[PDB]
Subunit: 147 residues, 5 copies
Amino acid sequence: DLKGPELRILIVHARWNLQAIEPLVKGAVETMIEKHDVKLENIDIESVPGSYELPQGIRASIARNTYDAVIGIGVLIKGSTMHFEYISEAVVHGLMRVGLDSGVPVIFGLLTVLNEEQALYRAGLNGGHNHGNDWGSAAVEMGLKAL
Amino acid sequence: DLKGPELRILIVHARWNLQAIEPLVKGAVETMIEKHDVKLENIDIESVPGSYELPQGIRASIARNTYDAVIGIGVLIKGSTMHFEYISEAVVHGLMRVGLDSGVPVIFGLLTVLNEEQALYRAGLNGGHNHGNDWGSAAVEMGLKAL
Amino acid sequence: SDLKGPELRILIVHARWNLQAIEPLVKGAVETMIEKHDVKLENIDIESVPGSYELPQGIRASIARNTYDAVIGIGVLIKGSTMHFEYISEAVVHGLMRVGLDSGVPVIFGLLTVLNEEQALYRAGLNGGHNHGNDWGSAAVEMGLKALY
Amino acid sequence: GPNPSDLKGPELRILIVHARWNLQAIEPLVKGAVETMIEKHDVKLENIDIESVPGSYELPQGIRASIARNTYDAVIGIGVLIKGSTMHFEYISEAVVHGLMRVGLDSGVPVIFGLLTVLNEEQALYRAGLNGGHNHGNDWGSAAVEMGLKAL
Amino acid sequence: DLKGPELRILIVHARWNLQAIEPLVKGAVETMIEKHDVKLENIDIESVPGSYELPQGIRASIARNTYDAVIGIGVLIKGSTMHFEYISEAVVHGLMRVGLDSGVPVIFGLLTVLNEEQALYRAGLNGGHNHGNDWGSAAVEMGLKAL
């Protein structure tokens, strides 16, 4: 029931696992537009190579333009090394810092999964629920409450 | 023993798991009022979508109004992925930062459980103790000591 | 130790969870500072907070109002059925470190992070163990002096 | 897999700070990074500064010191950490990952995480392009260029 | 090949496990002197009770005098509780912050082992290599590069 026709939303997503990323971004956008009246022109969609650059990508963007809310999207899958654990730890803290420093709401749209299936399931495939929808609504709500 | 009739208290809670959240918020409010003489009109109750927004929701509110203490309430349940571990990590650190930056006492009313039953038990259901009561007293005590 | 700090002003903030273990710890710290380091009883402020999570904020608030040469944060955390223990420990350990580095005031880590009650009591000097409160009292005095002189 | 670009950064100034532990793995990584930025992104050899520090723990400080003296559009921190018999591995990794993030966010300069956190030597060499693996240095080089440009 | 005759080095070490600490400190000092031409009178050696005080001990010292590099030395052995894990976590981050805040290179000379034997082995005893030597060279190198 929350409508944000004047909200300016920023979406920065990594490019790793497009098979999972795309469904997530679509869900977020479609949800904001169809269910919250956000205007397509007001949604900026940017990207970075991997999830590690998500924090800096967001900080750089919110320094140039003004946004009411931001959604950081990326997919991390546990591999053979400890890489997964450390990147997740760095990003989860990084996004929190960027949001608290800037005063701009930052929605955590990062999937930290054990395998590909868990990722796709959370992107709405194979009978799962698209988490991007949830993030889209969260962005709108936080955007309005930030006033 | 501690009475804070002039205290202004803020409560920000996530909306995930209302079955557990409500009992927790009720307990906190009721305890502050009935046991600490806090005035109903001096208690602001706000909400955010999920626990990850708890730190930002709080930072934003304590920047607009003045409160003597804040209680951050949310429920996190371990799931199939690593989502639980990283959100918990981020929120626990984020709340601590918001409290130390602002100088305003922040009570940690976050349940980090393995299953729904553990959450409900800690909300006072099924023969358990409502942790919201404890948080309510903690807020009043910290609010007064902050002067 | 042969270090004497008769002019030192010490702050002790402890949580109230597990008084059975907290009291011996605080007593040990106070008695050691007094009997072994010549700290004056009137120069030792003892404050408390509900739980260990409030330890960092309780300390930050106090060192902003008064001046202390050293601070001892005391609390007892016991592993429970949930992940509560792990996250509170994490937040407190980092919070204390930050309060100390921000203020320039030495903060002694008097937090027990145990698996069960017996481990805590044993480290508070009961059942044949050594009272860690003693060590914290001495550490406080040493850091206090090295912070001034 | 990943997802690079065709982006050209002829005016970009890139800094590379690497540890010296495990040169057998470090070298391939640095070469990959450099070669990819040159051959595939048109970065000029003269605009690439390569510096080093003893171990990975000094990576954050080495970077902070350098970006305070000169101006770079992007930085790549490279190092290799192998799990050993103690907890040394876990704590050094934790400190470095957070340290790099802080340096990048404090300075506003993009910092690429070129740190390998593996269980054994084989895993490191494989990710350096040896024994049939993919050289991760290449990916880091493209990431640096892309962030360098987007930082304007 | 690196000589630092004008470098001023600070060594702060804990006093827990002197059996392992001493060889580490000697290794660092002897290496800086015999192999890097650092002058004995330019090496300040201080101490704190335990490893948790390492960060503050260092911050306090580099605020009073000027050093080109600092080496924090301490030994942490896993015990029956979680004490080991949390102290290690706090110190590893603390040192990093002190170094990044001050701009002074800080060498991590902290051993985080499972038992005494592992510590002594890394201090040069029982056929092992003295890690103190490495730290000494690291301090000299970072001190010069800091210019």
